């Protein structure tokens, strides 16, 4: 994973996201959704999803939430006050903690001012405390600003490492983007049916065709402009649409 003071930032983009494999995996110790309850994720579409990743203590997972305070949310990773995404977290004691202490997971414990939301700060300047210019030298009136979790496998829960992923769905002003997977039943034939072909909504009997579209045309129209043929997206075969009987 990535440190807590330099979190990662993956920009998930156009694709088919299935938050159900996440939601029901039962391996997550914390799955909170804020802008939107979890079950309705596989039924919405946004412009971008960002995923941030890092590793913290066990009992600092309560500062990854909109409107908190503490050494993590103050200056390591700050969530805006109208967050929209979801926060996922699971214990990882066996992977990240090693006998003798894993001193490779640091965090920032001194900063001039709390972070703006989603702001990031990887500098390593000596936190000058005393009015006396530090001059880049340690000692008194000057602290190094990074400390390290010394994780060890015999730590009580709440001191064992937890891995955290923060999904943030954003909606700029584009034309569209990633959404949840769609569905489909079994295209029936020779029965007055109520059909939807990726947008085309209609009613009628469907029948095997013998016309030949050009290999970019979806549906065919008549003179007087009524849909009378379609192409099945999955199998790519042309089917005529006749109305069902009235009189």
């Amino acid at each position: 994973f990535a440190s807590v003071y330099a979190w990662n930032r993956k920009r998930i983009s156009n694709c088919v996201a299935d938050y159900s494999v996440l939601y029901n995996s039962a391996s997550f110790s914390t799955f909170k959704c804020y802008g939107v309850s979890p079950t309705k994720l596989n039924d919405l579409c946004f412009t971008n999803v960002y995923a941030d990743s890092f590793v913290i203590r066990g009992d600092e997972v309560r500062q990854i939430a909109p409107g908190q305070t503490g050494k993590i949310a103050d200056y390591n990773y700050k969530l805006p006050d109208d967050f929209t995404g979801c926060v996922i977290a699971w214990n990882s004691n066996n992977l990240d903690s090693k006998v003798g202490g894993n001193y490779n997971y640091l965090y920032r414990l001194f900063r001039k001012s709390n972070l703006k939301p989603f702001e990031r700060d990887i500098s390593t300047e000596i936190y000058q405390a005393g009015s006396t210019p530090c001059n880049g030298v340690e000692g008194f009136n000057c602290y190094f600003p990074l400390q390290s979790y010394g994780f060890q496998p015999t730590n009580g829960v709440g001191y064992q490492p937890y891995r955290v992923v923060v999904l943030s769905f954003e909606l700029l002003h584009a034309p569209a983007t990633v959404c949840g997977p769609k569905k489909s039943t079994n295209l029936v034939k020779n029965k007055c049916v109520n059909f939807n072909f990726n947008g085309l909504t209609g009613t009628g009997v469907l029948t095997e065709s013998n016309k030949k579209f050009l290999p970019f045309q979806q549906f065919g129209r008549d003179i007087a402009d009524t849909t009378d043929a379609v192409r099945d997206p999955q199998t790519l075969e042309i089917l005529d649409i006749t109305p069902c009987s009235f009189g």
Partner: antibody, heavy 115, light 108 residues
């Protein structure tokens, strides 16, 4: 180097109040973790409150609410305005500059008798 | 669940000797705490850092021994001038738990 001195202790009754001034004799109380440590006489210590370099409170368990900490950087003073003392705090108060551990923490008293 | 640290108090010794004080930790803590010297009627002074890296401005008589739990301090070659109590703490976590304190007597 740093020689923190505090003032403001005395005697009062319940529902009273009192401001304590951890006078930062010494430098830069604007950017340091500071805290209040309390002990009743004949007893072990106890922790009260804490300010962050950036502003946060996190009060203790029993003194949750009814108790307020602040700083003043231009005056180099920490301010502890309390009120409604259950008189059950009659104690010897310390203010210490947490520097990755603690140390550097003066002394100062108080009593909250009902007379 | 908070940690409750314990100590075998009321020590008694003579000068120039070895004495050893342990500090229980009734939960899985890591290895970051600290010892203090509390002379009577005064302010504490921390000796052992967040483990054993003794903080500066102290003599060579203290030897903090750290672990996962069951931390232990040891004074070797005593000197008549350490009449006070010694506490444990527990840095890192905000509300921290303190020890019980061990007074140490000096035989004559």
């Amino acid at each position: 180097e740093v020689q923190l001195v505090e003032s403001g202790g005395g005697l009062i009754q319940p529902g009273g109040s009192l401001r304590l001034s951890c006078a930062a004799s010494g430098f830069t109380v604007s950017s340091n973790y500071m805290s209040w440590v309390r002990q009743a006489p004949g007893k072990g210590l106890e922790w009260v409150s804490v300010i962050y370099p950036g502003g946060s409170t996190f009060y203790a368990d029993s003194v949750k609410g009814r108790f307020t900490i602040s700083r003043d950087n231009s005056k180099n003073t920490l301010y502890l305005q309390m009120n409604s003392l259950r008189a059950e705090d009659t104690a010897v108060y310390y203010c210490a500059r947490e520097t990755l551990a603690f140390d550097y923490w003066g002394q100062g008293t108080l009593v909250t008798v009902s007379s | 669940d908070i940690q409750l640290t314990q100590s075998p108090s009321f020590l008694s010794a003579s000068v120039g000797d070895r004495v050893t004080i342990t500090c229980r930790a009734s939960q899985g803590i890591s290895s970051y705490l600290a010892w203090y010297q509390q002379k009577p009627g005064k302010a504490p002074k921390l000796l052992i850092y967040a483990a054993s890296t003794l903080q500066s401005g102290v003599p060579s008589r203290f030897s903090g021994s750290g672990s996962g739990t069951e931390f232990t301090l040891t004074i070797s070659s005593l000197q008549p001038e350490d009449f006070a109590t010694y506490y444990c703490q527990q840095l890192n976590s905000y509300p921290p738990a303190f020890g019980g304190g061990t007074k140490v007597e000096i035989k004559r």
